[PDB]
mmCIF file of N, CA and C and ligand atoms in Angstrom:
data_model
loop_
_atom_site.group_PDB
_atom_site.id
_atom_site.type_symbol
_atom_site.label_atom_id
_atom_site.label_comp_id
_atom_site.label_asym_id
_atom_site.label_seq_id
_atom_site.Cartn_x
_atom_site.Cartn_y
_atom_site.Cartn_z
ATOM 1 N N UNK A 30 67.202 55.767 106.367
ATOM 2 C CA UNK A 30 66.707 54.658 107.285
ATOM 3 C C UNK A 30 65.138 54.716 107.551
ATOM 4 N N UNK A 31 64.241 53.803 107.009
ATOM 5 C CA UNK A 31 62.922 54.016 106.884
ATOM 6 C C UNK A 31 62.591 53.051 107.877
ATOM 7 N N UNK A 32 61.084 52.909 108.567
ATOM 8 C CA UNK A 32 60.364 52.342 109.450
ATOM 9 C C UNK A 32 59.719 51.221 108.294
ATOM 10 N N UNK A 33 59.032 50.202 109.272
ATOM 11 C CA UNK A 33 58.255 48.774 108.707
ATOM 12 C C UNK A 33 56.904 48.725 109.316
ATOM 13 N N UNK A 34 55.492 49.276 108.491
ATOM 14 C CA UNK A 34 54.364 49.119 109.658
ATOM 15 C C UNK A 34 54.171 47.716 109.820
ATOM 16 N N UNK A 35 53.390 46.946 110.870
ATOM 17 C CA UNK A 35 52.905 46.029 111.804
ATOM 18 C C UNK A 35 51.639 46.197 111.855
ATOM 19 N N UNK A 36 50.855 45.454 111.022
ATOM 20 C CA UNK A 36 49.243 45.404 110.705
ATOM 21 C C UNK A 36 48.755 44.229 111.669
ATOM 22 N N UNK A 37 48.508 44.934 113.154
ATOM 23 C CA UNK A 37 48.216 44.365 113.911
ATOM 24 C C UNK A 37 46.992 44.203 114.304
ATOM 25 N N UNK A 38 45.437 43.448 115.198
ATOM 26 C CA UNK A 38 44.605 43.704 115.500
ATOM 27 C C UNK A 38 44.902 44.495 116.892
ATOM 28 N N UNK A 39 43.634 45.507 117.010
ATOM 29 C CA UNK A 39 43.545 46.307 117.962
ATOM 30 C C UNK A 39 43.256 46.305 119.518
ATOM 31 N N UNK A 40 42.094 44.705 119.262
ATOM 32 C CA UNK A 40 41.744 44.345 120.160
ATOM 33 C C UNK A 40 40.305 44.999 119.988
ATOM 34 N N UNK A 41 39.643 44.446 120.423
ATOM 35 C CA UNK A 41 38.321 44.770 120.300
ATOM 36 C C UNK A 41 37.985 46.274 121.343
ATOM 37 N N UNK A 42 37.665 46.906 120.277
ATOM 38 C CA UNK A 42 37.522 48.265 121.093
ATOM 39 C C UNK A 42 36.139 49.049 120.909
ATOM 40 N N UNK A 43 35.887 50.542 121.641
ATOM 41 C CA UNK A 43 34.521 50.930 121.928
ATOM 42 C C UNK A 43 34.505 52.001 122.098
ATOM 43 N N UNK A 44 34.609 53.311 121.045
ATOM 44 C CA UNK A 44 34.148 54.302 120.914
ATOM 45 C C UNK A 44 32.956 54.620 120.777
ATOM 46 N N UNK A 45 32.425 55.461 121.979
ATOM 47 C CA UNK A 45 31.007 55.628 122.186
ATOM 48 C C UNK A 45 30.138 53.972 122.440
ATOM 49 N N UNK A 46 29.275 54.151 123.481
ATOM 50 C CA UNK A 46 28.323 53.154 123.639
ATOM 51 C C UNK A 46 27.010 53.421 124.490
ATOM 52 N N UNK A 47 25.621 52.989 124.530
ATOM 53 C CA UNK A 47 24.535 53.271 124.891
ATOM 54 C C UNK A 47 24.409 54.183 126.120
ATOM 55 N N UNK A 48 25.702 53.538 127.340
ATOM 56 C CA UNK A 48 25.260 53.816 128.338
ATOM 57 C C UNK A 48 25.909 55.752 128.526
ATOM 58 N N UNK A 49 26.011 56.115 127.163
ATOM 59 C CA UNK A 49 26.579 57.539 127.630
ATOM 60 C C UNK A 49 26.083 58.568 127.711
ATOM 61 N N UNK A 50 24.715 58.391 126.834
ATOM 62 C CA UNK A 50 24.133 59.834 126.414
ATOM 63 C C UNK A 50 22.779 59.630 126.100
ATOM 64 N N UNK A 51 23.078 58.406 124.787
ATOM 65 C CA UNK A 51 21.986 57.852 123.815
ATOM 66 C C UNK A 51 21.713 56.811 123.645
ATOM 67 N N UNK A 52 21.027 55.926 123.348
ATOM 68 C CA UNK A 52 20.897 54.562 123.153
ATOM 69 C C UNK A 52 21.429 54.222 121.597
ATOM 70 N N UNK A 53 21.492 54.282 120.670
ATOM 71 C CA UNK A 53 21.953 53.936 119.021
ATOM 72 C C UNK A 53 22.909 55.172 119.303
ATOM 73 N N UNK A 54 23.547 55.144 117.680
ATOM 74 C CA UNK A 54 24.666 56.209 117.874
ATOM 75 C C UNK A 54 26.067 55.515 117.965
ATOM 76 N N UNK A 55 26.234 54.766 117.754
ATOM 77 C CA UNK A 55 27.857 54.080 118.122
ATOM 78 C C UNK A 55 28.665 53.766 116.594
ATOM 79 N N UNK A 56 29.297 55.000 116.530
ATOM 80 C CA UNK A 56 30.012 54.826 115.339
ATOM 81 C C UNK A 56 31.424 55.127 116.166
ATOM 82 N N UNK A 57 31.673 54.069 115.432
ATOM 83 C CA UNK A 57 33.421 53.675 115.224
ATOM 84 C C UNK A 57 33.933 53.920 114.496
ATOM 85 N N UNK A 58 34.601 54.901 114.419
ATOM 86 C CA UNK A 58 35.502 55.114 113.115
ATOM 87 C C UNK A 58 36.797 54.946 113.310
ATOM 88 N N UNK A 59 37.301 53.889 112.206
ATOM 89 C CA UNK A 59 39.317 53.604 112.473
ATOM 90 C C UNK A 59 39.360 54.540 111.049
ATOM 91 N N UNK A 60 38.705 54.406 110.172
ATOM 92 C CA UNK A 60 38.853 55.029 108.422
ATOM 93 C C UNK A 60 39.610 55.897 108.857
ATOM 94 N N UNK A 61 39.451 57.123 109.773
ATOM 95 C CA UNK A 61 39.877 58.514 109.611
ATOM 96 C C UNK A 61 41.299 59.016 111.123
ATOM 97 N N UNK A 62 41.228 57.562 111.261
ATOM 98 C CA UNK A 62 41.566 57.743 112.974
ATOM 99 C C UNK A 62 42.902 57.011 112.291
ATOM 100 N N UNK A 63 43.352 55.359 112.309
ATOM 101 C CA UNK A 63 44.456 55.160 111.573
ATOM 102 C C UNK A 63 45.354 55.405 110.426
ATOM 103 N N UNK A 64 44.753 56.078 109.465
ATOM 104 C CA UNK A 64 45.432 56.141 108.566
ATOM 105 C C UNK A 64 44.023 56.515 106.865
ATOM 106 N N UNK A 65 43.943 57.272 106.894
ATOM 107 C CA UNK A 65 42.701 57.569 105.433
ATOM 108 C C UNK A 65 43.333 57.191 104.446
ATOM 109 N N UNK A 66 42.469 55.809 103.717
ATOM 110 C CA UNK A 66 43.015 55.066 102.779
ATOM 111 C C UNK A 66 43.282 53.970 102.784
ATOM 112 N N UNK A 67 43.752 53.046 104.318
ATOM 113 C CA UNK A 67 43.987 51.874 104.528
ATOM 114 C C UNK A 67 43.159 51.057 103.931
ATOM 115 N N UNK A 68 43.574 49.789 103.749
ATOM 116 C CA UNK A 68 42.999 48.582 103.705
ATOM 117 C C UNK A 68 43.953 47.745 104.199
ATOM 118 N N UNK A 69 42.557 47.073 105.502
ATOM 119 C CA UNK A 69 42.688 46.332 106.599
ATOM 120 C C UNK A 69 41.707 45.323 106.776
ATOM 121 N N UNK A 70 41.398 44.426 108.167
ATOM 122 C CA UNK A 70 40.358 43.929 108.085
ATOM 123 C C UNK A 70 39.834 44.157 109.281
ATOM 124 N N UNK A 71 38.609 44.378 109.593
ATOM 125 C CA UNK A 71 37.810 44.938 110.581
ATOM 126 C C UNK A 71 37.032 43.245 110.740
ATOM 127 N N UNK A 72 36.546 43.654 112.529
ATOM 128 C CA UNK A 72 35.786 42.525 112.624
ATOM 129 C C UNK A 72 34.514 43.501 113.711
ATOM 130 N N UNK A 73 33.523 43.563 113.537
ATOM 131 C CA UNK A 73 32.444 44.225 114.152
ATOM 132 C C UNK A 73 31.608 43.422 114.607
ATOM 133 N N UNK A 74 31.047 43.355 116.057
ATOM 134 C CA UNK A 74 30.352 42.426 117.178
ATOM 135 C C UNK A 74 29.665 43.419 118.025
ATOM 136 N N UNK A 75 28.721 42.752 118.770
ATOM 137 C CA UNK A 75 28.649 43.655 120.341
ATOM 138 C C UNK A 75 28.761 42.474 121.500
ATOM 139 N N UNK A 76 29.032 42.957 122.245
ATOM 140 C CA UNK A 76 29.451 42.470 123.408
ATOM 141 C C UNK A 76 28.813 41.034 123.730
ATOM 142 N N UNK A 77 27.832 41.175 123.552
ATOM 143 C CA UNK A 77 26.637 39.752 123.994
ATOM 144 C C UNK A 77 26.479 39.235 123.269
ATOM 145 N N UNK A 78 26.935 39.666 121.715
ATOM 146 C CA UNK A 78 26.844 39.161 120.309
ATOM 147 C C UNK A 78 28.257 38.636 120.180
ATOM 148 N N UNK A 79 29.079 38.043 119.840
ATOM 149 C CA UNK A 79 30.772 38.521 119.846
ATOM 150 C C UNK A 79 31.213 37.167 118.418
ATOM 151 N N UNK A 80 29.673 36.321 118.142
ATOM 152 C CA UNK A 80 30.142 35.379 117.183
ATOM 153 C C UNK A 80 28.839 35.910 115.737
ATOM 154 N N UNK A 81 27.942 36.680 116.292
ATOM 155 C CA UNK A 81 27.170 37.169 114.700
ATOM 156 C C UNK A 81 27.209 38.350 114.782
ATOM 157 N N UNK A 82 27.185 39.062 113.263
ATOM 158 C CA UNK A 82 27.446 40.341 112.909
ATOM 159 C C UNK A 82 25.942 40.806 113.144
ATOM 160 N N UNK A 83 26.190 41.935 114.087
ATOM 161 C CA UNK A 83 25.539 42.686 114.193
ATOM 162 C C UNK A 83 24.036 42.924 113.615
ATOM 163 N N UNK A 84 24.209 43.221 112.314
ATOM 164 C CA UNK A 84 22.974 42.851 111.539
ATOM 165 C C UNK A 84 22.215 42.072 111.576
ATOM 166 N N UNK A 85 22.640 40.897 111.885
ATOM 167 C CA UNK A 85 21.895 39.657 111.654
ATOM 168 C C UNK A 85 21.025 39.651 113.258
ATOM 169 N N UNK A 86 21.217 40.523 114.139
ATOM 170 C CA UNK A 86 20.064 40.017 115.300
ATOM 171 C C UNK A 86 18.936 41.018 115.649
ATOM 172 N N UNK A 87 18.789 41.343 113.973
ATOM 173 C CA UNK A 87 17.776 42.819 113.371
ATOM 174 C C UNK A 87 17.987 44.271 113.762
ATOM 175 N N UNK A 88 19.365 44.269 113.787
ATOM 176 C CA UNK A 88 19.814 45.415 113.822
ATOM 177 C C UNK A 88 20.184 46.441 112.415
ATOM 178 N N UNK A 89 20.479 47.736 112.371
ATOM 179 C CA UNK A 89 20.275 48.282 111.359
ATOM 180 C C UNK A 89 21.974 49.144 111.876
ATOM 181 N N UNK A 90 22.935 48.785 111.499
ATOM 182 C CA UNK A 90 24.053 49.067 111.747
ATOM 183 C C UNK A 90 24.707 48.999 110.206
ATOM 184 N N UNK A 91 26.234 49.567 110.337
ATOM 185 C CA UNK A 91 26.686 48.936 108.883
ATOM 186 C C UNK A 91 28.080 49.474 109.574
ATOM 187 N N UNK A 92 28.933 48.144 110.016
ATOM 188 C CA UNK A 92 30.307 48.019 109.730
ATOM 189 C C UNK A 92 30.781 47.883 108.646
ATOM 190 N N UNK A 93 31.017 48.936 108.153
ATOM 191 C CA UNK A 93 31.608 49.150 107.002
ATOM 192 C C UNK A 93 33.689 48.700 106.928
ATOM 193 N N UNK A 94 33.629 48.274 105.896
ATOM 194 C CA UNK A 94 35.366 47.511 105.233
ATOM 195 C C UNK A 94 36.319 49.141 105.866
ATOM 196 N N UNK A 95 35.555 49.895 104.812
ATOM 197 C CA UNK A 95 36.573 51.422 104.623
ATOM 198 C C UNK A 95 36.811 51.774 105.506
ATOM 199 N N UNK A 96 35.557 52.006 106.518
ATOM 200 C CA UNK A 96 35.443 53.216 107.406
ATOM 201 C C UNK A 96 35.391 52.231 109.066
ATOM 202 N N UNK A 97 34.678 51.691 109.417
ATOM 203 C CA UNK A 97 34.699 51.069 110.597
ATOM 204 C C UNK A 97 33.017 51.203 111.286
ATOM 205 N N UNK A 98 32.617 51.367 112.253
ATOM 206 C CA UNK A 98 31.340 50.464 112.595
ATOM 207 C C UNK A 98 30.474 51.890 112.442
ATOM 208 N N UNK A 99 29.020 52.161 111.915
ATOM 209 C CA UNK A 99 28.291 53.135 112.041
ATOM 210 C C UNK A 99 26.823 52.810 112.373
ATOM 211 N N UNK A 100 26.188 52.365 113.896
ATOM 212 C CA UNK A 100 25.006 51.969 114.459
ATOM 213 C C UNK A 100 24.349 53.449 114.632
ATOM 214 N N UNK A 101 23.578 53.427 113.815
ATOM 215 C CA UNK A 101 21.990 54.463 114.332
ATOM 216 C C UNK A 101 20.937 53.528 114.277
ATOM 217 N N UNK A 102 20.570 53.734 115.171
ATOM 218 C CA UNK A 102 18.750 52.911 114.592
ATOM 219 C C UNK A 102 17.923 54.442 114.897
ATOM 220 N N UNK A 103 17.340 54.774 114.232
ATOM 221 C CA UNK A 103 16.279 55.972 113.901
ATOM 222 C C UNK A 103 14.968 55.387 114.043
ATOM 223 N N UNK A 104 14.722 54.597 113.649
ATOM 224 C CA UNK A 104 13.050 54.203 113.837
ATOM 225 C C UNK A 104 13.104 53.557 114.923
ATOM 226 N N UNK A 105 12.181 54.357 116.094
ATOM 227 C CA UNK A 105 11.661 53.554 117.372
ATOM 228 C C UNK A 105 11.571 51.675 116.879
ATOM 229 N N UNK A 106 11.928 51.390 118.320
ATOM 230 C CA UNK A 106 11.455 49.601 118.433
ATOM 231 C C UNK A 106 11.716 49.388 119.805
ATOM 232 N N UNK A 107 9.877 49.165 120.133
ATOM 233 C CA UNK A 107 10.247 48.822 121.833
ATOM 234 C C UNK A 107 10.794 47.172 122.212
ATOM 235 N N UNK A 108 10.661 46.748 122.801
ATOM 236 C CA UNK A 108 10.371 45.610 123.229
ATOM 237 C C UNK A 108 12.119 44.578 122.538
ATOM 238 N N UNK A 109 12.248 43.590 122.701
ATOM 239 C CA UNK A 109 13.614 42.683 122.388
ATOM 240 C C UNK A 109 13.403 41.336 122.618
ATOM 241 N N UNK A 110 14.313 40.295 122.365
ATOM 242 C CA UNK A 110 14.482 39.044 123.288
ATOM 243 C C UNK A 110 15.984 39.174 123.849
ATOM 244 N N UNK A 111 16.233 40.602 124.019
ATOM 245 C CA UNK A 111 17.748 40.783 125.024
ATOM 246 C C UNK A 111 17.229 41.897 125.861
ATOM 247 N N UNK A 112 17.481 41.910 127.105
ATOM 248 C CA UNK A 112 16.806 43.163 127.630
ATOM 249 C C UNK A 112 17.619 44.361 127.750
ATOM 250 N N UNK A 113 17.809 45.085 126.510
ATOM 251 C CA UNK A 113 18.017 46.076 126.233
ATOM 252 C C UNK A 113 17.268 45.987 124.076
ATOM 253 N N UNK A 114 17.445 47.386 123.824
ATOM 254 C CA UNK A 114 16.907 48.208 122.921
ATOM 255 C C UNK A 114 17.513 48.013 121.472
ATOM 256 N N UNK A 115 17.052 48.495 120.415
ATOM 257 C CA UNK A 115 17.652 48.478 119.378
ATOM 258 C C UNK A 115 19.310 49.047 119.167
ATOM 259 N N UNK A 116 20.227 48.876 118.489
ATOM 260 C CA UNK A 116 21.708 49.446 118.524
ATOM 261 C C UNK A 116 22.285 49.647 119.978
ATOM 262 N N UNK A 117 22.540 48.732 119.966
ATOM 263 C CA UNK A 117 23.202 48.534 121.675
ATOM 264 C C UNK A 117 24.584 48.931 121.186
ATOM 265 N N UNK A 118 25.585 48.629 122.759
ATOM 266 C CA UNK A 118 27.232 49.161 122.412
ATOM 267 C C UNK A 118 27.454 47.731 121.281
ATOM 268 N N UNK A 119 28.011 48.329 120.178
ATOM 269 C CA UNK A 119 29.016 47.435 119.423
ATOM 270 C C UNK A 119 30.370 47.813 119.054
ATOM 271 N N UNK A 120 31.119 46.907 118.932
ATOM 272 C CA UNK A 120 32.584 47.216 119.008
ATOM 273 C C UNK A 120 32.854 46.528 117.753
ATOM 274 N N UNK A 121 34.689 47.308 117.573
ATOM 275 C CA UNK A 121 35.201 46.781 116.588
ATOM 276 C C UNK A 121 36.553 46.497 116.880
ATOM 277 N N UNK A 122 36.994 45.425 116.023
ATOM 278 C CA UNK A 122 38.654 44.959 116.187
ATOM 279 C C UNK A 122 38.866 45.080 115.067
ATOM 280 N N UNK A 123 39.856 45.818 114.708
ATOM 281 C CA UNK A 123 40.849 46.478 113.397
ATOM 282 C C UNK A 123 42.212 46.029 113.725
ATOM 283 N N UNK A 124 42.339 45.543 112.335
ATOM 284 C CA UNK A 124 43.964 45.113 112.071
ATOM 285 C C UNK A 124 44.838 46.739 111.767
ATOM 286 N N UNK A 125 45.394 47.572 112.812
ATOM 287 C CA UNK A 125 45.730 48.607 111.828
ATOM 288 C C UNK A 125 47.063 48.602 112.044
ATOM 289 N N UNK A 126 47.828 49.337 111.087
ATOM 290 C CA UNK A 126 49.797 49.260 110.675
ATOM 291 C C UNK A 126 50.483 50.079 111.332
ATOM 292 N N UNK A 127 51.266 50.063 112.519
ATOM 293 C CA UNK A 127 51.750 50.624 113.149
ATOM 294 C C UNK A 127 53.792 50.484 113.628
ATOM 295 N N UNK A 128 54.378 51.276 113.796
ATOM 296 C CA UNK A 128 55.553 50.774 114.083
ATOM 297 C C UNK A 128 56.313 51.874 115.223
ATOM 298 N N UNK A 129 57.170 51.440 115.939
ATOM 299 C CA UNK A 129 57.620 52.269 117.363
ATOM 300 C C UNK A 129 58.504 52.098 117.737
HETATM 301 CA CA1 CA B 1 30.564 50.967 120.864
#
């Protein structure tokens, strides 16, 4: 008698974010956390962002397919037109396969 996974979304979720330690730094990882090997579909945003990817508001992030969201920004950048800093909290919603 075998189980049926349920490739569900996660809901938009937030491992690690600015206000904890560091400002950049917000990697998300589902790759190693659901299941190593999946293929799923990830959707990666930040909070104030929630309709363009990340990248596109000159950020230096890479939500990656495999692995799930990995924000460092390493090179200083003062100043914004959001008042906060380079690699802010970004989150991710993962479809991952589950059954219970
Ligand atoms: Ca985050």
């Amino acid at each position: 008698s075998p189980c049926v996974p349920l490739c569900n979304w996660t809901g938009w979720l937030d491992s690690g974010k600015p206000n904890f330690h560091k400002p950049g730094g917000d990697t998300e990882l589902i790759g190693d956390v659901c299941g190593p090997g999946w293929a799923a579909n990830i959707s990666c945003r930040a909070t104030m962002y929630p309709d363009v990817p990340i990248g596109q508001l000159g950020q230096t992030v890479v939500c990656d397919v495999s692995v799930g969201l990995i924000c460092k920004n390493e090179d200083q950048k003062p100043g914004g037109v959001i008042p906060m800093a380079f690699c802010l909290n970004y989150e991710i919603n993962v479809q991952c396969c589950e059954c219970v």
